[PDB]
Write a protein that binds this ligand. Structure first.
Ligand SMILES: [Cl-]
Ligand SMILES: [Cl-]
Ligand SMILES: [Cl-]
Lengths: 202, 202
């Protein structure tokens, strides 16, 4: 990693925290520069403006989340047992996707749907669609191996995600309440997987 | 209907249109009064502040949407053919929930749920949970009649909604709607019902 690459990562990290803490209107290029330990000049040269920088924050978060999802879908491909394997995936998906800072960023992206529509388009393409596509590729391979039966693996992926997250994600987005014991998290993931296998299991 | 109740209803209808057009901060009590055919003093006498009026907008929309869904679920609860009946429910749910104006209001609620937690809780309890509850009530009755098997009706309702809406609702929230034809959304609804019946059908 070059010094320029590291500085850019530091700037995006600082911007991500600043936007979550203050919102778009509550922060500035100058404040982000200070938080990142960068000169104002460097932040302007590399990111142009606050709107552009917010777009890079969205893309960085989408990439980070998807790297995690890729690691967990790879683990499912190494499981002998589909119910346990899917339970482990579901439990990790809930923990990753219900992360408090990630939920705060999601709210900001939605709040800016009209003002900066590109943020939500980027999240949808590079975040949401990419994690369903990764899960779909995993399910296709599992289907080819006779371990599950998903004819439309992308649809099947959206069904798993939808059963798993419809209540918790909406509860967070509407109430801010993002609370669950380890016991509740697991019971929820397992019930979603049971229903999923009722449709897509062999 | 009393004169006062009519004035309240008219102000709420005006406020609903204003908020959908320009958002929370972009809407003024003057604009609302103008649309309603009321003085700004009267709007303040009836609602106290813009936050309170927005809360009443949220409650009114929650009630309107749920009256529609309750009609659909009550009819299904008396039905005899399940595939067709559930397709009708799912197709109507996606039609109702994909309404451009409702989606705008939903983005506004999410955008403001952090700063107006009472408002987001109101949509969650009276909007989101009520449509699951109406659906669960229907499933409970159908299970009692031996037509489906949903031992946990509210969980099964959450599964139908999650399967139906994970893609369309996320796409709408992040990208400013779907843009999908009625035909595509109806086919999506049918697929969701096929999956639902593989888990919960007899
Ligand atoms: Cl913001
Ligand atoms: Cl400087
Ligand atoms: Cl909703």
């Amino acid at each position: 990693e070059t010094r320029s690459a590291r500085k850019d990562r530091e700037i995006i990290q600082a911007a991500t925290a600043a936007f979550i803490s203050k919102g778009y209107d509550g922060t500035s290029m100058e404040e982000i520069a200070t938080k990142a330990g960068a000169s104002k000049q460097t932040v302007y040269k590399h990111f142009t403006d606050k709107e552009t920088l917010f777009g890079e924050v969205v893309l960085s978060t989408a990439s980070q989340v998807n790297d995690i999802i890729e690691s967990v879908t790879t683990l499912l491909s190494e499981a002998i047992f589909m119910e346990g394997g899917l339970q482990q995936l579901a439990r990790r998906l809930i923990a990753v996707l219900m992360d408090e800072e990630l939920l705060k960023l999601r709210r900001l992206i939605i709040a800016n749907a009209d003002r900066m529509p590109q943020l939500g388009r980027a999240w949808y393409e590079k975040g949401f669609e990419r994690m369903l596509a990764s899960t779909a590729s995993c399910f296709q391979k599992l289907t080819n191996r006779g371990l599950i039966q998903t004819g439309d693996p992308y649809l099947a992926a959206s069904h798993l995600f939808g059963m798993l997250l419809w209540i918790p994600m909406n509860e967070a987005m509407f109430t801010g309440s993002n609370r669950r014991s380890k016991a509740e998290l697991e019971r929820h993931a397992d019930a979603s997987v049971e229903a999923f296998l009722a449709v897509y299991g062999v």
